[PDB]
Amino acid sequence: AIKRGADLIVEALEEYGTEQVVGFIGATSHFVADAFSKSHLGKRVINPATELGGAWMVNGYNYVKDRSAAVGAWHCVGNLLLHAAMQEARTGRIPAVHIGLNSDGRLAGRSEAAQQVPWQSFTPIARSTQRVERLDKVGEAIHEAFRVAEGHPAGPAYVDIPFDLTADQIDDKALVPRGATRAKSVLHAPNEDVREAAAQLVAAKNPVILAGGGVARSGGSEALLKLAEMVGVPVVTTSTGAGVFPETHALAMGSAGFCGWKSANDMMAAADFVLVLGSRLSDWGIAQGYITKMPKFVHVDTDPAVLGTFYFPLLSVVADAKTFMEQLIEVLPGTSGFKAVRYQERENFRQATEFRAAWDGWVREQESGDGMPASMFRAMAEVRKVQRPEDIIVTDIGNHTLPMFGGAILQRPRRLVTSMAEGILGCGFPMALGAQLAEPNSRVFLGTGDGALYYHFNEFRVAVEHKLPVITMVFTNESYGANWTLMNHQFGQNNWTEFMNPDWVGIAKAFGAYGESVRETGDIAGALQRAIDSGKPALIEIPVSKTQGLASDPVGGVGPNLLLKGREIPVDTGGSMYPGENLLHL
Amino acid sequence: AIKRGADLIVEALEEYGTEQVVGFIGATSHFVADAFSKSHLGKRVINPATELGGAWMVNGYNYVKDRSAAVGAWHCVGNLLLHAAMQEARTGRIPAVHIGLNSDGRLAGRSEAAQQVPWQSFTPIARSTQRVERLDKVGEAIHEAFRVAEGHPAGPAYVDIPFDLTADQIDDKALVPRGATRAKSVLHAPNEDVREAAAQLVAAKNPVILAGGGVARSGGSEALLKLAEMVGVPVVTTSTGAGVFPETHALAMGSAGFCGWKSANDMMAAADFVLVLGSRLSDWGIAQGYITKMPKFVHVDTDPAVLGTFYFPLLSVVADAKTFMEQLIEVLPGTSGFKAVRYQERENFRQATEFRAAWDGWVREQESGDGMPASMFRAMAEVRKVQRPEDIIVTDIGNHTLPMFGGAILQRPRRLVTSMAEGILGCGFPMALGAQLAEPNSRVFLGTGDGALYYHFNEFRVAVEHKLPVITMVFTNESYGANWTLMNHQFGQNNWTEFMNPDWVGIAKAFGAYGESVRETGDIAGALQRAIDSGKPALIEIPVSKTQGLASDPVGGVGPNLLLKGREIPVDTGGSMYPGENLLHLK
Amino acid sequence: AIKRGADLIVEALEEYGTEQVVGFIGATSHFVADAFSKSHLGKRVINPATELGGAWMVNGYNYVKDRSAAVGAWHCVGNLLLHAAMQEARTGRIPAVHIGLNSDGRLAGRSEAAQQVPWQSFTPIARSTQRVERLDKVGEAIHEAFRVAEGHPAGPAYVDIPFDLTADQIDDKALVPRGATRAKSVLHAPNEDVREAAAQLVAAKNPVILAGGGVARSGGSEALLKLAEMVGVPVVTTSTGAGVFPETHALAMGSAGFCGWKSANDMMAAADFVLVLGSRLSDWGIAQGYITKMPKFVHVDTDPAVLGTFYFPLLSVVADAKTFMEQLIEVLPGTSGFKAVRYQERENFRQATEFRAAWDGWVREQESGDGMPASMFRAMAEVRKVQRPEDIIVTDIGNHTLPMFGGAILQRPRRLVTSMAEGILGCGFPMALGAQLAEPNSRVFLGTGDGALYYHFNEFRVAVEHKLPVITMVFTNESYGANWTLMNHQFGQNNWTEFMNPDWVGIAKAFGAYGESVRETGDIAGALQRAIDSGKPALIEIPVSKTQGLASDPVGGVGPNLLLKGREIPVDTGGSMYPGENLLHL
Ligand SMILES: Cc1cc2nc3c(=O)[nH]c(=O)nc-3n(C[C@H](O)[C@H](O)[C@H](O)COP(=O)(O)OP(=O)(O)OC[C@H]3O[C@@H](n4cnc5c(N)ncnc54)[C@H](O)[C@@H]3O)c2cc1C
Ligand SMILES: Cc1cc2nc3c(=O)[nH]c(=O)nc-3n(C[C@H](O)[C@H](O)[C@H](O)COP(=O)(O)OP(=O)(O)OC[C@H]3O[C@@H](n4cnc5c(N)ncnc54)[C@H](O)[C@@H]3O)c2cc1C
Ligand SMILES: Cc1cc2nc3c(=O)[nH]c(=O)nc-3n(C[C@H](O)[C@H](O)[C@H](O)COP(=O)(O)OP(=O)(O)OC[C@H]3O[C@@H](n4cnc5c(N)ncnc54)[C@H](O)[C@@H]3O)c2cc1C
Ligand SMILES: Cc1ncc(C[n+]2csc(CCOP(=O)(O)OP(=O)(O)O)c2C)c(N)n1
Ligand SMILES: Cc1ncc(C[n+]2csc(CCOP(=O)(O)OP(=O)(O)O)c2C)c(N)n1
Ligand SMILES: Cc1ncc(C[n+]2csc(CCOP(=O)(O)OP(=O)(O)O)c2C)c(N)n1
Ligand SMILES: [Mg+2]
Ligand SMILES: [Mg+2]
Ligand SMILES: [Mg+2]
Ligand SMILES: [Mg+2]
Numbered sequence A, C: 001a002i003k004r005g006a007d008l009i010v011e012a013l014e015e016y017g018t019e020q021v022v023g024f025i026g027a028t029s030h031f032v033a034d035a036f037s038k039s040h041l042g043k044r045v046i047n048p049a050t051e052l053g054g055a056w057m058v059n060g061y062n063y064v065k066d067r068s069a070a071v072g073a074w075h076c077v078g079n080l081l082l083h084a085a086m087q088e089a090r091t092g093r094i095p096a097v098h099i100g101l102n103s104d105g106r107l108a109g110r111s112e113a114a115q116q117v118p119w120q121s122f123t124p125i126a127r128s129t130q131r132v133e134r135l136d137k138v139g140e141a142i143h144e145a146f147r148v149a150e151g152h153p154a155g156p157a158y159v160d161i162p163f164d165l166t167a168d169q170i171d172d173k174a175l176v177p178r179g180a181t182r183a184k185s186v187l188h189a190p191n192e193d194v195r196e197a198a199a200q201l202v203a204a205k206n207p208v209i210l211a212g213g214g215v216a217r218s219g220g221s222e223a224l225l226k227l228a229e230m231v232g233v234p235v236v237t238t239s240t241g242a243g244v245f246p247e248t249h250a251l252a253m254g255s256a257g258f259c260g261w262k263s264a265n266d267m268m269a270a271a272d273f274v275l276v277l278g279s280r281l282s283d284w285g286i287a288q289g290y291i292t293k294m295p296k297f298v299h300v301d302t303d304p305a306v307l308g309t310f311y312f313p314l315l316s317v318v319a320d321a322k323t324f325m326e327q328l329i330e331v332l333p334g335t336s337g338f339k340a341v342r343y344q345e346r347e348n349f350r351q352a353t354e355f356r357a358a359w360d361g362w363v364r365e366q367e368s369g370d371g372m373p374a375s376m377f378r379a380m381a382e383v384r385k386v387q388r389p390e391d392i393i394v395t396d397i398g399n400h401t402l403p404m405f406g407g408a409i410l411q412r413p414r415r416l417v418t419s420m421a422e423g424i425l426g427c428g429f430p431m432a433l434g435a436q437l438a439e440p441n442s443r444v445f446l447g448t449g450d451g452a453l454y455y456h457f458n459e460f461r462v463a464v465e466h467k468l469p470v471i472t473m474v475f476t477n478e479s480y481g482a483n484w485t486l487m488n489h490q491f492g493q494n495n496w497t498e499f500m501n502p503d504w505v506g507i508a509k510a511f512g513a514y515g516e517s518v519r520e521t522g523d524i525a526g527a528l529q530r531a532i533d534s535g536k537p538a539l540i541e542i543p544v545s546k547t548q549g550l551a552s553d554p555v556g557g558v559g560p561n562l563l564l565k566g567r568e569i570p571v572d573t574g575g576s577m578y579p580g581e582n583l584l585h586l
Numbered sequence B: 001a002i003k004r005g006a007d008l009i010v011e012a013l014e015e016y017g018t019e020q021v022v023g024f025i026g027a028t029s030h031f032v033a034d035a036f037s038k039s040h041l042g043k044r045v046i047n048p049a050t051e052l053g054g055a056w057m058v059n060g061y062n063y064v065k066d067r068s069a070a071v072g073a074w075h076c077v078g079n080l081l082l083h084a085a086m087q088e089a090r091t092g093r094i095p096a097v098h099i100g101l102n103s104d105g106r107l108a109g110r111s112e113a114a115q116q117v118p119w120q121s122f123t124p125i126a127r128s129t130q131r132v133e134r135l136d137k138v139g140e141a142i143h144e145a146f147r148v149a150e151g152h153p154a155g156p157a158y159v160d161i162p163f164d165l166t167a168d169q170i171d172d173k174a175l176v177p178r179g180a181t182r183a184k185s186v187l188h189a190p191n192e193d194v195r196e197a198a199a200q201l202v203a204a205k206n207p208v209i210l211a212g213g214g215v216a217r218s219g220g221s222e223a224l225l226k227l228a229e230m231v232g233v234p235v236v237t238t239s240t241g242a243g244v245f246p247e248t249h250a251l252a253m254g255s256a257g258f259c260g261w262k263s264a265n266d267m268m269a270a271a272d273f274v275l276v277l278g279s280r281l282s283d284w285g286i287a288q289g290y291i292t293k294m295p296k297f298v299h300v301d302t303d304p305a306v307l308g309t310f311y312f313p314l315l316s317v318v319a320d321a322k323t324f325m326e327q328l329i330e331v332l333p334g335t336s337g338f339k340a341v342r343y344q345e346r347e348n349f350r351q352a353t354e355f356r357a358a359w360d361g362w363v364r365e366q367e368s369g370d371g372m373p374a375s376m377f378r379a380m381a382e383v384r385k386v387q388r389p390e391d392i393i394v395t396d397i398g399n400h401t402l403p404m405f406g407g408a409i410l411q412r413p414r415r416l417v418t419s420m421a422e423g424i425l426g427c428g429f430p431m432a433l434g435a436q437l438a439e440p441n442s443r444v445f446l447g448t449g450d451g452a453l454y455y456h457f458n459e460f461r462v463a464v465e466h467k468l469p470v471i472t473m474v475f476t477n478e479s480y481g482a483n484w485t486l487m488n489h490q491f492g493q494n495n496w497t498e499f500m501n502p503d504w505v506g507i508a509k510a511f512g513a514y515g516e517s518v519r520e521t522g523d524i525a526g527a528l529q530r531a532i533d534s535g536k537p538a539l540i541e542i543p544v545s546k547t548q549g550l551a552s553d554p555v556g557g558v559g560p561n562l563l564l565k566g567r568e569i570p571v572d573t574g575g576s577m578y579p580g581e582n583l584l585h586l587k
């Protein structure tokens, strides 16, 4: 059949499992938007306020799905706003296909052309960047983008298609590749690696299992619970792993790291051995600025590139996390030293339950205070009173990150969402809409800073029009609080950190969202209830302090050290001059 | 002599004429922000709601100054939001220096590092991209960035500095290059080229002078007025040149192009010869999608890359526009065929005034009607009643761009501001705030679509805190109106074009800005008076049609052609298969 | 200890298993060459005639070793000659670390600087490109280059180091990373993928096993022989797989492809099922220009990126080749339909032995003719008379490639060497020296075209000085014969294909190598014997025809189709003009 390039793009997206499109109109995306109107996928298109906002919605959607189920489709110069959200998708292992419709290929390369987008600007960011030159390559390029996005590591793929190819027509026989099969990711380890891992776990005096986001992608929750109870070993997570182990369990120490739970950081500091499953041991995760001293450890990942890149393990294993844990459970009964004992009766149990008890006690102190300005831990205690096991907690980047991570007690995977890998401010609100779209039976609670919300609150348009009932708490301190605190620490003085807020209640109301301030009442519980009862997206304005959280609270972290001291650098004495220095010698 | 890298960065910026910093705080820009607090630039700091809004402010400030007077200074990952503004700066010839402070150079190249920004993403966009490796190269790199940025052509320069270098200390002797005098840009043309141009101009039956952006940069307004009156030749502009020739003059035909004045397009279609001064003859300018047929022409520019790249001139001249006009003025009296008569007495004068009067009559007609929805041409007629020669008109991108350009009647250079080169949606409000900052005693009027305003109205924080009293009119139609109109024409149906507006008055009021809707009054005149009287940034909501403007109004345009017909493309029958096609051959 | 950057580079190379350095001197490599003189590795440095020649020696060395055992180290502007050999290492999966010493970092970025090498020119080629900014990062960068080079896929890694860092000094504590462990590559498949593969093999009427270079990297020869005899299935290889199965076995069909053995191409055309092990199914390999129609197949690779990229398998499996084959052998006895029968008694045996017999018969016809000009198949028959099982056959790119591939009958892996992935002319001679250096108990026989040998015969310097007794046959036809033939086919006329040769015997003699022409004698057997007896590198000049081989001989290929016909392309009618067209409308 003769079809337009635009029709073929839509066909390819459908064929590879696309569920949601986030799209922006302009002359170069007109044929694509028309094609979409004639197809199933056309019923699910979000038109965002900005392309960057839309790109964050893709990331929030796909983060919780672990596939490229949301796809961006953008008019040429709109693609120029993608890079920040794309960089998060790359280091954060978020599958994300973006299709940019560039201007007419006939005008490419002409110096005075308009809206010829430099697609090569994505080469250092996307896991795959393709410029499509020929109509008969559109299906093949889209196929390749999805293979790349959904591989190990997951990440973003950018496809640049000059829009004249979307208007042109071609016979479609075999053009969109069909019948594609994927290899399983259930990679098994060799018996001897399994036995060695088991023997170390058994011989350790104070082992820990460290479960990262890979355990979530793996589906390894059930095997992890079994394993930990069988060996009687406390479980620490990364922030992307949090919730793969029920955080109300006695062996649950929570997440390690600089914004994590002190019980986890204590347990990591006390451990003599760690079994790491599905973690990349990253800079703002377990590495803490590459300061963390890891105990002897076994490291199991599906991505060989993360194994041994910085931390040298006792043993590295290329295996799926669930599968590895299943292999361990089978081998443990024939492992020298293993005794089947209730985890409560093991000798390491009391130390772990002590660490968790002290952390819980500290959290209870943080959340117990009444009144205004509010504790962000108190705000999270109120959320927990109305929270379901499938609900999603979203945060932005700032002081507020710490109380959000600390007051989230999670029972399922992929329920904690932010710009994890890159810490890009403004991510929260639009990632929350993305997650809501992907998970319509989850209530989505976002705790955002005021500096953060300033970025993409324009997307209340999308929250209102698509009836996405995200409950947003905006923590107001009229400051970039983390920056305030860190400057205060480093210099004893802050600069560029202070600003005015609008009447956020008034902003919400102007969009037709639910709005309420607790500034005078302190009634967070009632504000949450009325917000939930409205059925609308909601904004609850909650004044807090400039310093509570990431930059001040002691949770046992050791880094990252962003507060450098300098070094004195020797001048170059080799005899060569500086530019302009010739005039000094005259 | 002993200084931190952060102090040397500040010292270099001050040395090369920086007047305004637009900066964004974070763990990598902490040192820089501290150093700036020790400088007189410390009081001239704008902290924008987002780095992209800030980068648009940089573009608006520098567009009106023709130098990199405003500089950006950004925490590592905020640099990832710059690309769209930076691309307009590149093709739009706006000088712009951006300093990105990256994360620690010790952590660079680690696969699991956080906030290590891929500075290489700027290589295809900036006219200069540098990654500084060494503390003793920071002054040198910044010097180079200004050299590129304020060259011919002007554009953006990006410098990536790992922030450990900003904390490190070094003896500062000779580190910041100082005391350069740049080359003059008053390039003279050869005598023979000036005399050939004079002879073409005199021999033409119906000549036109086309003045672009380059005439504004050259400071050539006075020379142009003298040349145009002395030969009696009508003047056509590009949108960036508009105002270099007073548009109330009898010889002013306005701007040619698809959102230009019909008088200018009528003139261009009637001319037998064009003298092109400081125009790049661009896709969305004079070329109109490379469909415009140019008459025989002489092309004078300082940038040889634009001369003969697409349209082949009769004669190409590398020279400064002002300087060339001066040279022409001096040779014309000795040029065979020249006659010294008042421009009103030439026979070509009548046709030009007819073209201008028919255009003015059409504009008068678009101004009439009342009440609701209102005409955007009516909105501009009300602005003109309150507008002084030094005041600035800003627009965003969409249907509304055409009445903003058609309703702007300008008497000075650099008074019409937008994302000219790239038509990046959203640009209007923050570029207007940048322009206001550059000219605190000019009034700045913005006409913006509702789609457009949605991008960076968050920068009302900056407008309110810094008391930048931009007068913004937001044209409401609950639509990407251009898309609605054109998609209906292409396909019989619009898609992805419609959206809800907030209560725009309520948004302004929530920021502390002046807000008023004319939905129930039609009282644009009174709204403008009250907005001006408020002394605050102001937002006036004006309901408009989905169709008025760019997608609907005939102004003599021939292009561009974005509403493509397909071609049917032959399949490759050489024997190579598609991916997956192996499955289709299994019997 | 305070050490120079140069000393630290040498330390890192030693620590990561470097055996051979190929190095070129200049002001920027002076400190490195000095450091090398003070260390074990300094005894093994080849100084080549050119950096490109040297880069091919790295590729020949590392091709046969399957690790980055040879390393390039180059003065700044010398690195500009690397790109061709580096591109082969990338698509050809050859591990190769190259260290470029750039000019002084103080002069970087200055427009009028000399010898500031644009290291970004390697970004699109190397699997990893790093520019080192800081002395304390030299060890870490070299560590990362080796992890990358020796991963799956293998490939080149480029490290650019401004030479001032090689002269500078730093305390060395922990600077070079030590104690690095690698994950095994013995990835196991899930039981159900194994059982499904076994069931298909058993149920097939005419199965084939296709073994690629991955079987060589895997060490899978023994398991392959067992498997094939157990199921009674004929074995086809790729050209990089050739020799993983003894090519004198009754089930050995040889290599498929456009320069392969007709028995293999027949068997592929007759097969109803293929089990593909360690092959990427490439353009100039099995795909034959993407024209080859693959039967239903199972595809097993360690690199998920090759699985399903073009050919859609019945099943894709991420597993090590040897391990997979071991798993199959275990599962086969409990697989429905399997009967233990001598492979000679299976029903498919007669068809396979017929295909091989016809091919052998054709080869015997090609090699039997006496006299001059010579058959290149006759030349390969003479090599076979003096050939050991560990000997290496090298070829360059041309008509001569086909007889070289056809007349090589191999019994061990990694014995057939050329620019396999990219077909870059001139590769042969220097790759042969590289292979000789890596394998000093192998005799290395190169059959090269005259157009090919012209590139890097300057490296006879290296062959003579290091006593590398490569036996080179130069096939003279005074032409780029493959080009002659293909132009003749396409146009009926050739252009740019003809040239003069020097007296090649005289060239060899001028270097102190052994030289002999068979132009008058036809005595290839005696020339080989005297060349071998000399103990020197040798050149034997052998006139041949312009057309024998790749471009003419029927071996059952179907592609690639480089002889396109064109299509008529519609003009653009949208109304926009060409540059300069304005003058046509005047
Ligand atoms: C302000 C801020 C504060 C933060 N604080 C913390 C903190 O305190 N603690 C913290 O942990 N993080 C924190 N982060 C997040 C941190 O930056 C990283 O995003 C996070 O630590 C990475 O988690 P991970 O190591 O589990 O790997 P991920 O990024 O989740 O990647 C998944 C890993 O699992 C592997 N994998 C995938 N699938 C499988 C499978 N099937 N089998 C095996 N392996 C698989 C992948 O190859 C990869 O190595 C913070 C972020 C910010 C912005
Ligand atoms: C929606 C939309 C509609 C538009 N419609 C129109 C329209 O109708 N008409 C129109 O013209 N534009 C239009 N534009 C703008 C258009 O895209 C270009 O930005 C504009 O035409 C470029 O102007 P210019 O050719 O004068 O060159 P500029 O971009 O202003 O560049 C300046 C030129 O002069 C040169 N120069 C600089 N200094 C000197 C000197 N001292 N001496 C000599 N030469 C010098 C430079 O090298 C360069 O060639 C539109 C844009 C948008 C987004
Ligand atoms: C003139 C010329 C003619 C040619 N003619 C032919 C021809 O007729 N036939 C032919 O085959 N080639 C031919 N080639 C070579 C061809 O271009 C390719 O280089 C070759 O076919 C690739 O072999 P391969 O598919 O085995 O993969 P390789 O390039 O050898 O790559 C190895 C593959 O095995 C995998 N692998 C690596 N280790 C393991 C492991 N442990 N377990 C599992 N998998 C692993 C890798 O991921 C990869 O997919 C020719 C080249 C030239 C220049
Ligand atoms: C795009 C971007 N710009 C700047 C920063 C630096 N940054 C990190 S946290 C932060 C503070 C955010 O302020 P707010 O959202 O109000 O949260 P608070 O610290 O007050 O809780 C800043 C400015 C960043 N990470 N990303
Ligand atoms: C970043 C970006 N996204 C999309 C476009 C395509 N585009 C061009 S004009 C326009 C319409 C703008 O709508 P509005 O501001 O409401 O103006 P109207 O057309 O209604 O006057 C769009 C979506 C663009 N140029 N830039
Ligand atoms: C670097 C390079 N240049 C050109 C070619 C194109 N090419 C491929 S085979 C060949 C013929 C080589 O001639 P020769 O070595 O004499 O071998 P013959 O075909 O005569 O056997 C040519 C020119 C190539 N592959 N690589
Ligand atoms: Mg479907
Ligand atoms: Mg805040
Ligand atoms: Mg609108
Ligand atoms: Mg050793």
Ligand SMILES: [Mg+2]
Binding pocket: C398, C449, C450, C451, C475, C476, C477, C478, C479, C480, C481
């Ligand atoms: Mg030849």
